[PDB]
């Protein structure tokens, strides 16, 4: 499964690299992708909650990476 | 610029769609992409802060989308 996640990640990263897209642009696109998914696959009532858990995970991820 | 953002977004979304990747898997990959970018292009001292602003934007985005 790790190889599955990693492959998805690599594929998405290459997309950003191919466009030589700036950091801010990359984040904006990535954020919109999350927003798109939540709106299209998460019930309106849980959307904010899933968004917040995504955010917490991101924050924790970044923090720990600061090790 | 909107077409530029939208094109990036579409390209990333197609990547997820091609894998028929589940929502949770998509989020995990997307989150890792943000983490990757922050670690590779944002100074260690601002990383958490940029991560939090990304999160706020995401949260606000989702909220407003609930209109």
Curated annotation (Swiss-Prot), chains A, B:
Pfam family, one: DUF1414
Transmembrane segments: none
SUPFAM superfamilies the UniProt entry points to: YejL-like
Highest taxon listed in the record's lineage: Bacteria
Family: Belongs to the UPF0352 family.
NCBIfam families cross-referenced by the UniProt entry: PRK13689.1
HAMAP family assigned to the protein according to its UniProt record, in alphabetical order: UPF0352
This protein's name: UPF0352 protein SO_2176
Species of origin: Shewanella oneidensis (strain ATCC 700550 / JCM 31522 / CIP 106686 / LMG 19005 / NCIMB 14063 / MR-1)
